[PDB]
Amino acid sequence: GSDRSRFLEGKRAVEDKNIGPLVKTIMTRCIQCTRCIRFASEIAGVDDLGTTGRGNDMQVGTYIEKMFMSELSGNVIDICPVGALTSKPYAFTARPWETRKTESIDVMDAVGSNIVVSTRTGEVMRILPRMHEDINEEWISDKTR
Amino acid sequence: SKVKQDMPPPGGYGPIDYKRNLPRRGLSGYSMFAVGIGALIFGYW
Amino acid sequence: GVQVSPSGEKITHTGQVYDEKDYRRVRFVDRQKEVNENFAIDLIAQQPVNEVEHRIIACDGGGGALGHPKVYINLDKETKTGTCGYCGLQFKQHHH
Amino acid sequence: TQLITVDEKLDITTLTGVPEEHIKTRKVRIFVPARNNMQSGVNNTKKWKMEFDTRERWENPLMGWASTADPLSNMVLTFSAKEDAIAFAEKNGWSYDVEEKKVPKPKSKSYGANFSWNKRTRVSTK
Amino acid sequence: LKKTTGLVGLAVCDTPHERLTILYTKTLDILKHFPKHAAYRKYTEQITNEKLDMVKAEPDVKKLEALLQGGEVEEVILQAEKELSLARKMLKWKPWEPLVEEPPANQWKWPI
Amino acid sequence: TYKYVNKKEQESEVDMKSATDNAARILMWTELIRGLGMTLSYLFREPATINYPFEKGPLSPRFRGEHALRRYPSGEERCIACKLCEAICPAQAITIEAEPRADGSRRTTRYDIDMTKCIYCGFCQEACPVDAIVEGPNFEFSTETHEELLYNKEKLLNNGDKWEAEIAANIQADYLYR
Amino acid sequence: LHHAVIPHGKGGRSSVSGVVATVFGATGFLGRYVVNHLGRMGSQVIIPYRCDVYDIMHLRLMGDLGQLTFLEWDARDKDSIRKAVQHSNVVINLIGREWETRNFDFEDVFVNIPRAIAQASKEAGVERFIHVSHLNASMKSSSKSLRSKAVGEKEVRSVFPEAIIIRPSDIFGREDRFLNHFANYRWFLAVPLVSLGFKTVKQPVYVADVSKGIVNATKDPDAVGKTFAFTGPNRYLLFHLVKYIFGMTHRTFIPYPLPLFVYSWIGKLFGLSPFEPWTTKDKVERIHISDVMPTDLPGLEDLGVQPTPLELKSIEVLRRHRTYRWLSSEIEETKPAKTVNY
Amino acid sequence: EKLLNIQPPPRAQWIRVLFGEITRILNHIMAVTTHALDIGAMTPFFWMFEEREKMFEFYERVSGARMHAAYIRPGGVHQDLPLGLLDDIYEFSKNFSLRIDEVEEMLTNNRIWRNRTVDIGVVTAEDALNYGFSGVMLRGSGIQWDLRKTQPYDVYDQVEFDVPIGSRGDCYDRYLCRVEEMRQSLRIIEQCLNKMPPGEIKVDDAKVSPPKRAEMKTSMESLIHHFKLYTEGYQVPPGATYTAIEAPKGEFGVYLV
Amino acid sequence: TSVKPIFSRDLNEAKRRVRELYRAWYREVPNTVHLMQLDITVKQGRDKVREMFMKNAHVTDPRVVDLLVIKGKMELQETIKVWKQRTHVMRFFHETETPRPKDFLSKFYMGHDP
Amino acid sequence: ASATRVIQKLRNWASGQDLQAKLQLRYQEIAKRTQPPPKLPVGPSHKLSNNYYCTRDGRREVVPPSIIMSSQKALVEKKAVTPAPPMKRWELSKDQPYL
Amino acid sequence: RPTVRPRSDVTHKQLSAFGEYVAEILPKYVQQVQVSCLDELEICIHPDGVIPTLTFLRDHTNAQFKSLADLTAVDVPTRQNRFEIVYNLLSLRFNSRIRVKTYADELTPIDSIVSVHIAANWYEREVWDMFGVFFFNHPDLRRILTDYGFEGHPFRKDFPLTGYVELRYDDEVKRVVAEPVELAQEFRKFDLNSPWEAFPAYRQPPE
Ligand SMILES: NC(=O)C1=CN([C@@H]2O[C@H](COP(=O)(O)OP(=O)(O)OC[C@H]3O[C@@H](n4cnc5c(N)ncnc54)[C@H](OP(=O)(O)O)[C@@H]3O)[C@@H](O)[C@H]2O)C=CC1
Ligand code: SF4
Ligand code: SF4
Numbered sequence A: 001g002s003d004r005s006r007f008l009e010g011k012r013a014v015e016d017k018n019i020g021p022l023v024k025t026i027m028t029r030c031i032q033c034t035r036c037i038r039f040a041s042e043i044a045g046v047d048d049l050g051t052t053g054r055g056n057d058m059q060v061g062t063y064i065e066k067m068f069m070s071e072l073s074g075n076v077i078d079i080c081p082v083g084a085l086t087s088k089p090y091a092f093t094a095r096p097w098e099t100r101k102t103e104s105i106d107v108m109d110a111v112g113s114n115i116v117v118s119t120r121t122g123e124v125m126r127i128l129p130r131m132h133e134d135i136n137e138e139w140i141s142d143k144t145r
Numbered sequence B: 001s002k003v004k005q006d007m008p009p010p011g012g013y014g015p016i017d018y019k020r021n022l023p024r025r026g027l028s029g030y031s032m033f034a035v036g037i038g039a040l041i042f043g044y045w
Numbered sequence C: 001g002v003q004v005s006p007s008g009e010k011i012t013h014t015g016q017v018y019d020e021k022d023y024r025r026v027r028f029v030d031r032q033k034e035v036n037e038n039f040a041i042d043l044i045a046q047q048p049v050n051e052v053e054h055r056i057i058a059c060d061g062g063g064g065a066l067g068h069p070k071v072y073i074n075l076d077k078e079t080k081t082g083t084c085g086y087c088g089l090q091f092k093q094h095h096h
Numbered sequence D: 001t002q003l004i005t006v007d008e009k010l011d012i013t014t015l016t017g018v019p020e021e022h023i024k025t026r027k028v029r030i031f032v033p034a035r036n037n038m039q040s041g042v043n044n045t046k047k048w049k050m051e052f053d054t055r056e057r058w059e060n061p062l063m064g065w066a067s068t069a070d071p072l073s074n075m076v077l078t079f080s081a082k083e084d085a086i087a088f089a090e091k092n093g094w095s096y097d098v099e100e101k102k103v104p105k106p107k108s109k110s111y112g113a114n115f116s117w118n119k120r121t122r123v124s125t126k
Numbered sequence E: 001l002k003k004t005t006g007l008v009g010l011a012v013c014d015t016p017h018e019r020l021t022i023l024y025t026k027t028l029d030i031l032k033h034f035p036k037h038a039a040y041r042k043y044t045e046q047i048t049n050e051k052l053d054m055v056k057a058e059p060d061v062k063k064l065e066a067l068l069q070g071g072e073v074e075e076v077i078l079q080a081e082k083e084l085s086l087a088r089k090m091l092k093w094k095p096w097e098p099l100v101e102e103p104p105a106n107q108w109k110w111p112i
Numbered sequence F: 001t002y003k004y005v006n007k008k009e010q011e012s013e014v015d016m017k018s019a020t021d022n023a024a025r026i027l028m029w030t031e032l033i034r035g036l037g038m039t040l041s042y043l044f045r046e047p048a049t050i051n052y053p054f055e056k057g058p059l060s061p062r063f064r065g066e067h068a069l070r071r072y073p074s075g076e077e078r079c080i081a082c083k084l085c086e087a088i089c090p091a092q093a094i095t096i097e098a099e100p101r102a103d104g105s106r107r108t109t110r111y112d113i114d115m116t117k118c119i120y121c122g123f124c125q126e127a128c129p130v131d132a133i134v135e136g137p138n139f140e141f142s143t144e145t146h147e148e149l150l151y152n153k154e155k156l157l158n159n160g161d162k163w164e165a166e167i168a169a170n171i172q173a174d175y176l177y178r
Numbered sequence G: 001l002h003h004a005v006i007p008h009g010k011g012g013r014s015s016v017s018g019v020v021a022t023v024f025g026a027t028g029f030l031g032r033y034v035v036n037h038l039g040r041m042g043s044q045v046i047i048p049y050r051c052d053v054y055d056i057m058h059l060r061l062m063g064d065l066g067q068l069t070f071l072e073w074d075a076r077d078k079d080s081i082r083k084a085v086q087h088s089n090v091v092i093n094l095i096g097r098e099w100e101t102r103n104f105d106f107e108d109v110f111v112n113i114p115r116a117i118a119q120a121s122k123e124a125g126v127e128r129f130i131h132v133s134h135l136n137a138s139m140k141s142s143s144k145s146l147r148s149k150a151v152g153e154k155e156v157r158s159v160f161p162e163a164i165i166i167r168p169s170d171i172f173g174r175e176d177r178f179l180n181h182f183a184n185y186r187w188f189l190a191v192p193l194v195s196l197g198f199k200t201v202k203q204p205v206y207v208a209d210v211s212k213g214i215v216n217a218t219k220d221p222d223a224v225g226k227t228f229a230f231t232g233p234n235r236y237l238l239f240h241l242v243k244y245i246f247g248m249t250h251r252t253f254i255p256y257p258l259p260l261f262v263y264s265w266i267g268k269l270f271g272l273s274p275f276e277p278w279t280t281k282d283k284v285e286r287i288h289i290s291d292v293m294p295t296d297l298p299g300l301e302d303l304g305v306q307p308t309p310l311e312l313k314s315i316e317v318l319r320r321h322r323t324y325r326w327l328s329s330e331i332e333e334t335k336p337a338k339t340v341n342y
Numbered sequence H: 001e002k003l004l005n006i007q008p009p010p011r012a013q014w015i016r017v018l019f020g021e022i023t024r025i026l027n028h029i030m031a032v033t034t035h036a037l038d039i040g041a042m043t044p045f046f047w048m049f050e051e052r053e054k055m056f057e058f059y060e061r062v063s064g065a066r067m068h069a070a071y072i073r074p075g076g077v078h079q080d081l082p083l084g085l086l087d088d089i090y091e092f093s094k095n096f097s098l099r100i101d102e103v104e105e106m107l108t109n110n111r112i113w114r115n116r117t118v119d120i121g122v123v124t125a126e127d128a129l130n131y132g133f134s135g136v137m138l139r140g141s142g143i144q145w146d147l148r149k150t151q152p153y154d155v156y157d158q159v160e161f162d163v164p165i166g167s168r169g170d171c172y173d174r175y176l177c178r179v180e181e182m183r184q185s186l187r188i189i190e191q192c193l194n195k196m197p198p199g200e201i202k203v204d205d206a207k208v209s210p211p212k213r214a215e216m217k218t219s220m221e222s223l224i225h226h227f228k229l230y231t232e233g234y235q236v237p238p239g240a241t242y243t244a245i246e247a248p249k250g251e252f253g254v255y256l257v
Numbered sequence I: 001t002s003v004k005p006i007f008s009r010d011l012n013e014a015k016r017r018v019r020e021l022y023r024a025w026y027r028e029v030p031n032t033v034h035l036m037q038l039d040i041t042v043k044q045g046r047d048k049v050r051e052m053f054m055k056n057a058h059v060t061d062p063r064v065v066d067l068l069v070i071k072g073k074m075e076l077q078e079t080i081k082v083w084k085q086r087t088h089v090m091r092f093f094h095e096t097e098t099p100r101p102k103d104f105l106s107k108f109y110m111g112h113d114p
Numbered sequence J: 001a002s003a004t005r006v007i008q009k010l011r012n013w014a015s016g017q018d019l020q021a022k023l024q025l026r027y028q029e030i031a032k033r034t035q036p037p038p039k040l041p042v043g044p045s046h047k048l049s050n051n052y053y054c055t056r057d058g059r060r061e062v063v064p065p066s067i068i069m070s071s072q073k074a075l076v077e078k079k080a081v082t083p084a085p086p087m088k089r090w091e092l093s094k095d096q097p098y099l
Numbered sequence K: 001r002p003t004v005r006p007r008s009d010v011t012h013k014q015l016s017a018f019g020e021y022v023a024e025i026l027p028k029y030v031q032q033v034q035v036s037c038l039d040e041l042e043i044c045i046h047p048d049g050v051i052p053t054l055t056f057l058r059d060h061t062n063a064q065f066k067s068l069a070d071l072t073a074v075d076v077p078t079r080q081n082r083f084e085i086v087y088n089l090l091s092l093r094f095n096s097r098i099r100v101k102t103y104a105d106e107l108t109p110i111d112s113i114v115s116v117h118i119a120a121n122w123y124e125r126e127v128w129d130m131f132g133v134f135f136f137n138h139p140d141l142r143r144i145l146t147d148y149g150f151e152g153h154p155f156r157k158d159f160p161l162t163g164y165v166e167l168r169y170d171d172e173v174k175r176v177v178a179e180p181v182e183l184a185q186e187f188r189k190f191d192l193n194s195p196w197e198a199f200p201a202y203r204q205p206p207e
């Protein structure tokens, strides 16, 4: 991108949702990329997310007060490029430059999915998925996350 | 609101001496030797 | 508001008090454990809610560049006031 | 006249000055680091990292900081090739575990599958 | 006629035309022992021949220094005798030979 | 261009008057008497010494002193636990452990600055996006133990509450340059 | 165990060993070595002091960033003792004097203060109490200090029934009052020994050995009420010991038989001093009291400490007292003293 | 900057030259006065250290610190000058040559100082070149070399000054060279004060220099670049350079890879 | 296979250089103990020299043996001068630190270290 | 500045130079400590138009160094050259040669 | 463009011509000649030709580089010869700078150039002290910057930032003693690498 902004107007703002105790939604910073919608339709297959409205007012989420709680539901936190869908337990605790990454495997599931444990100062801060095309591809489940 | 910034005066700053400046003073050698010899002769007498 | 542990020492705004059997109170023996009396959570709880007219309100910290980055808060929910993320200021749409 | 035959394994651990504990009782890991799943960029892959096994990081009694006892904790070493990393580990005398590079599989991508006539790939939302 | 060179440790060195002449002729005579295909021989013969030509052309010290552009004429003399020493050392060596050994493939690759 | 510092142009020959002048310079110690006069003039000048604890040395509003954590005029802490001051800290002197507060705001639980490790460079105060961490004008905070210079969040907030009447005025006088 | 007392961390000087300990004689001579070992292994050391902060300045290092907490105390202030011992797993008692002052005598120093410290430790519920008595401080001894240490040993046993009681011999080391005392005998004409230094057997013990024994006692699963005898590996006659000391000093050696009656008179004359006395009657009595054979008591060997011999760790003490002529002499220039068995 | 292929703005370059000559005066004051202190005279040390205190006050006004003023940066200059700084620099520099004259009169013609420094530590020009001195010993031995004249970097190519040249290669000639370099630094300071240009303070590239704080708090790209420059920093394209600057003590070089 | 030597063609003259260095250290130990006021004896220092040679005595590469000889000569040179102090020459003995035990029971009782 | 005329005359004569003109204590000629607020200018590339970053991206103008010869890539009458033209001799200063 | 440096293609061409000159004068040793876009000439040679290359550049008439500016080493521990020894040379006569590179490993020394430049004495002492690169025929080659009893070469990539030992005063032995290092803070490494490439001009071909 460029190094400056020519935007001299007021920015839009979108009211937040209450999608669950795992995914915190600050939807003001969503860029309307429909990645969560495509994931929840194809991989998770719940068909609960979508776009309501038109134009600059187009919003992502559920039209109703819906509790989006399935297994494999932190992967929207993974695939959301902006911080619109963040992890509620991993709320404000660490930063990626802080976190040391150890590549390990998963228990409490006999799939044995590959994960990365993000620790910091001798304390486990986050569990991210790894990439193994023969076990878990790019994502993990909610219990292991 | 015009641009305000640390700038020199429009005519520029004044002259600044930078060369070595020594006063170049003192009596001549003949005068100092003469007054020393005169003090010597007066004291001897 | 500062509180006092049953051990006796004060409790900080992030409550971290040493236990009864914790040895790390000799560092306070013959000295003091200083706690900032002005708890920011209480100080921002006692701030009034700003009544504004528009659906979207812009927040600084109170100065053009002395405040925080200028954000926008959407006051569409009538049930709850919109709080700016940097300060703790709350805004409510004056819908009358 | 200037070439001699040496059939050793190029051991320099007596010259490196490392204590024998951090030579013998140490396990290095050779690996292409995994892609950070929070981002789609892949530039942090494609270089072979050598790291050490993590030791104890305990809590400082005074301040609560993370205290450590081993010096080879932040010892990320970068290599352009797996064989180069193996040779460096063997030369310094560390036991190594090397794991293969996990390239993503090439995938068939077609935009027209989202509007299929009979297959299940037809989406319900753009 | 020159009183000082201005550089400490550099002597005044009167009659510099004869000294430059004998240094350049010695450099040429020792360059005659190099192989004909030696690029060092070819280039050093060019340099020494043109400097000897201008030292024969110009009889005045100041104008000769202006033509040579190697600082003072005593600096030129010192450079000439150092070139003679290099010619002897490069006769002892044999730098015109092919490359002794190819480097490894990633030896000069940056960044890694 | 260039100039000589000790080279002389030609010579002034030998003359009886010049020889007598040089002889008087050597025998009568004229340059030594001149140096005596110079330091005598310095004796009769006025000294530049200030009475220290009563007359302090001059400073500037940009001065980097003791660290402090500031607050909004509402009383809310300015810091939002974003950690980029410790990211830019060239001495790794800051530790910014954090968690959501009871009201859900993004605040810090541990904000430690090791003043024995800090190099007093102001990178934290020029990196902070909300003007939370500042380097106020306090420099007379020398302690008798090493531990008292290991600041925590309570100490930094106390310094911010103590020096806010001066830090705010300095930032007011300075913020248009930065 | 409470979570902050778990011994996590390799080695020492930056780790936690869970040996939170209040050391009461830390400002003296054995106390500096005990505090050094505790701070080296990495431990919370509470030092109550009554001397100047300048006099405790040498203890301000050898601890890592708040692992050493200094606090004032008074020997007549039960509140000060209680606030010293109220956060401590282990209390180590090293209070002692070689003389009697106007305020504190031998009975108070070796009985009343250890009893008060043990009582406060018991009421605060500390886990271990190590108390340093003396070897051959049994009972009915010729000197008042040894009888007082025996009575205080009984009092500490009565109040704190599981107190470890460590009885070292005459401890030698740097800035001691045994080797330096015998080396400072050179400032007079001769060496006034009782019965020419014969029929008096000593086995001095090293400071590092005693401090290592104390640290191993405060970490040891055993020693929950036991009495240890900390002695050196070799027993020497007093004459041979003083002759070895003056041989290592390279000064001279002229002994002199002096009866104990007039030697106690001279000791009282020297002890009549408002400052720290050079010697006293109790000091010469403890000098001429022979050490007992440690038969059934455990010691450094089963506390895990190898007793370093005086012939090994003697040059680091007596090299000060040499002149310039003999300053650069090694161990082999002095023949070792004859070791008796008896 | 050479690795990044960017140039600081002209106002930043002129400020960098002005404070370069200020550092040169500071360093030559320190060198001459501490050399005289080691020889045995301390009054020039006290006088020129009062002057050095004034220049440290200039540093404390232009930045935070008196000494370790992290001010000159790859993005030109961190912050602009406060409004009275140029006038106060002029007021210092118009009186400064008198102080150099006082020290010059105290030391230069003094026969004790001459006996202590003349024909002491004589370095020939060829030996200085072979030993790689390269800073002040070259021009003390007579070698006409100064990086500000031969390989100019900032606006030194458009300031005017002279390079003092020794002729005996001894301590006295080096002392004279340092005093004359102080005088020429005063000359360059006058030229910089006259020709300070009205521009911006840092290179207007937000991917290298941090933006202004107002723009950071009001703009999205500015906040993103502020965040990334103060967490990760700018990526320098790969390559190696050797950059040499005529520091007051000599050729100060950085080999950056 | 086919490397360039630095001083020694094979292991024999490398061992010869090792013996020369050991002779020099063995001769220098008494002078070091006399000059620097060391607490140790002459026997202890020579045993320490033998211990260092033994802990380096498992390498069969002539270049590595030559480099060890060179570094030993440098250390011997700064011990011949008093560039090394009492602290520097007593750092070889590790008189302060407690050695970590070699048994699994002790290494299990304290620390999670192999 | 607050010195008598006799002391000023003594100082000037003893120093050999006029001291009241250039005395090293600052009294009133310095700037006021309280200054009016500034208004710093914006530099170039604040143009809001014709200001694409790809046209002023100096950081990505850097290219890898050009190989003149290589023992691998190349696998390999004319005049002798110099790294640069020889440096012209410095001119003596005209305001003060001091030679 | 006020934010981009000028190029000076004239001095780039001059340095290219001189690189051709040196490469054809010394084909026995020169392995690579490159000129950067910053107009700096680098000549990468075989380690056997350090003495002839440095002597030619010290006193050749057209190449008078009589002043040695810098002598350093760069540890790249992924190539076979892990040390790149770099000489930065200054020509006062022609007002130029050249860079000469050679390579070494832990067991392959390089001939010292003290006979060519005397500053190379201390510079090669520093290189040996910080990287363990031995230098043949060096007078009094020894440590110059490390502690007297220091073990290991700390500027290597595999050496830790904090080292292996630390010093403290011990009152029992009354000395300054060395212990294994135990940090109370544990220096936090930061992964400050963007997963997006910044310079497409340096994009390496895939393996
Ligand atoms: N040292 C030896 O040779 C032997 C010693 N012991 C015993 O071991 C113990 C420790 O030995 P050591 O180091 O030599 O003793 P010290 O002479 O060094 O004194 C020990 C400590 O006792 C403190 N102390 C003494 N009197 C009082 C008092 N009235 N009130 C408060 N504190 C007091 C001193 O504090 P301050 O400095 O403030 O006065 C000092 O810190 C003693 O009990 C001693 O009797 C046993 C056998 C041999
Ligand atoms: S993945 Fe994130 S940015 Fe994309 S549409 Fe969903 S919430 Fe918005
Ligand atoms: S970090 Fe990314 S998602 Fe978060 S506010 Fe900034 S640009 Fe938006």
Ligand code: SF4
Pocket: F085, F088, F089, F090, F091, F092, F093, F094, F113, F117, F118, F119, F120, F121, F122, F123, F124, F125, F135
């Ligand atoms: S002033 Fe600099 S060193 Fe100190 S805390 Fe701030 S960023 Fe860190």
Ligand code: SF4
Pocket: F078, F079, F080, F081, F082, F083, F084, F085, F086, F096, F124, F127, F128, F129, F130, F131, F132, F133
């Ligand atoms: S002090 Fe400022 S920069 Fe540091 S974490 Fe808080 S808000 Fe961020």
Ligand SMILES: [K+]
Pocket: A076, A077, A078, A079, A080, A081, A082, A083, A084, A085, A086
């Ligand atoms: K996300």
Ligand SMILES: [Zn+2]
Pocket: C059, C060, C061, C068, C084, C085, C086, C087, C088, C089
């Ligand atoms: Zn706000």
